Amino acid sequence: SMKRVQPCSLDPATQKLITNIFSKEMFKNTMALMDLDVKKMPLGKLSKQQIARGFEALEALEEALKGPTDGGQSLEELSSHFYTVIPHNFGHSQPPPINSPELLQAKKDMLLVLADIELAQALQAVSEQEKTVEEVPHPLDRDYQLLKCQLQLLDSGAPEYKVIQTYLEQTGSNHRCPTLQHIWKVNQEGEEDRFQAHSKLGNRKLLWHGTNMAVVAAILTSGLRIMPHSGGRVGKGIYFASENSKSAGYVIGMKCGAHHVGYMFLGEVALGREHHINTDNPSLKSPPPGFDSVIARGHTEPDPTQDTELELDGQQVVVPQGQPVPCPEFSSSTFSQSEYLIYQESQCRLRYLLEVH
Numbered sequence: 001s002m003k004r005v006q007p008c009s010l011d012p013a014t015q016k017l018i019t020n021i022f023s024k025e026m027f028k029n030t031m032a033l034m035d036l037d038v039k040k041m042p043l044g045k046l047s048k049q050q051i052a053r054g055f056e057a058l059e060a061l062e063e064a065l066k067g068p069t070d071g072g073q074s075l076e077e078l079s080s081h082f083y084t085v086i087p088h089n090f091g092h093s094q095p096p097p098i099n100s101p102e103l104l105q106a107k108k109d110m111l112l113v114l115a116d117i118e119l120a121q122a123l124q125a126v127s128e129q130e131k132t133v134e135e136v137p138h139p140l141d142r143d144y145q146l147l148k149c150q151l152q153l154l155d156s157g158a159p160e161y162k163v164i165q166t167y168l169e170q171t172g173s174n175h176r177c178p179t180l181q182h183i184w185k186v187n188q189e190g191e192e193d194r195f196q197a198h199s200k201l202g203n204r205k206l207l208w209h210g211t212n213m214a215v216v217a218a219i220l221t222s223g224l225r226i227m228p229h230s231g232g233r234v235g236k237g238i239y240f241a242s243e244n245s246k247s248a249g250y251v252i253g254m255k256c257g258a259h260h261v262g263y264m265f266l267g268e269v270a271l272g273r274e275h276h277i278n279t280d281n282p283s284l285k286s287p288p289p290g291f292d293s294v295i296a297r298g299h300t301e302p303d304p305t306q307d308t309e310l311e312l313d314g315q316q317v318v319v320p321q322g323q324p325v326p327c328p329e330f331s332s333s334t335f336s337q338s339e340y341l342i343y344q345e346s347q348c349r350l351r352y353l354l355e356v357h
């Protein structure tokens with residue numbers, strides 16, 4: 001009647017990772033950090049229906065702002081409906097009206113993180129198979145297995161290790177530099193086949209993508225995604241940076257013991273033919289008709305003369321190794337650092353996960 005729990009197959013670093021990215025405490029923290037009222041909206045009550053209602057409430061708001069003053073509901077009443085469907089906590093004061101584009105997108109981005117938290121919870125549901133088997137995996141093996149994604153810890157003499165480390169150091173912040181703890185090689189399967197469909201596409205680069213810890217299990221499961229309400233300064237696709245310090249800005253870590261722990265991806269991005277912009281355009285949904293990517297060009301760029309290459313599944317993939325240098329032609333760009341954009345999920349492939357302190 002009592003099921004055997006099998007020993008854990010996972011090395012220490014991977015156990016800690018898998019513990020971190022499925023941690024209930026980490027999830028709640030992320031909710032409290034987004035002003036969500038965890039008491040009225042607990043992890044196990046979190047639902048796809050509810051997130052869906054939240055987005056519609058947001059949609060109603062966007063029509064309100066981006067529309068004119070017809071006879072519709074005020075922003076106050078429409079905000080209030082949103083806050084009924086997605087309960088927020090602001091020390092038991094009335095939450096603020098969502099009454100600017102900035103605020104609207106901030107709330108979309110929140111609901112996108114929460115969706116990925118619900119994804120993790122959904123993923124952890126116990127199947128009926130699992131009730132019937134008389135031995136179970138170690139809980140960390142089960143959780144790793146749920147990702148359907150391969151993770152291989154790199155040690156310091158792996159062929160790519162020094163390349164990645166140099167990428168990190170040279171393009172990370174000079175003073176407040178992220179401390180490298182571990183690198184995992186990442187192979188989500190079936191990501192492989194969408195990516196094979198861009199194989200005659202050249203101009204591949206390994207690019208940073210920072211995220212909060214709460215979406216890391218979602219990304220390892222499903223890839224980086226372009227969701228319906230996602231957006232930003234270069235519109236509706238997947239954001240990457242050649243400067244670690246840029247992507248580090250979007251990492252949301254958690255205090256663990258004496259450390260603040262955070263996670264960072266490197267994606268192989270098939271940029272093909274690049275279209276360079278120098279002003280924000282949040283409406284972009286694809287590159288211009290000849291092009292495969294949009295690069296919002298920064299004041300600086302890792303010194304291309306120091307670029308190296310890495311052979312990934314037989315393809316040349318460029319890895320910058322130089323410190324940022326000025327790019328005279330983009331000195332008046334609205335972008336201090338470059339933002340690399342692709343507008344279809346198939347154009348990127350997860351290659352590495354980094355733990356940094």
Ligand SMILES: Nc1cccc(C(=O)O)c1
Nearest residue numbers: 209210239240241247339
């Ligand atoms: N906006 C933006 C630009 C570049 C990288 C990132 C990131 O998520 O790492 C975000």
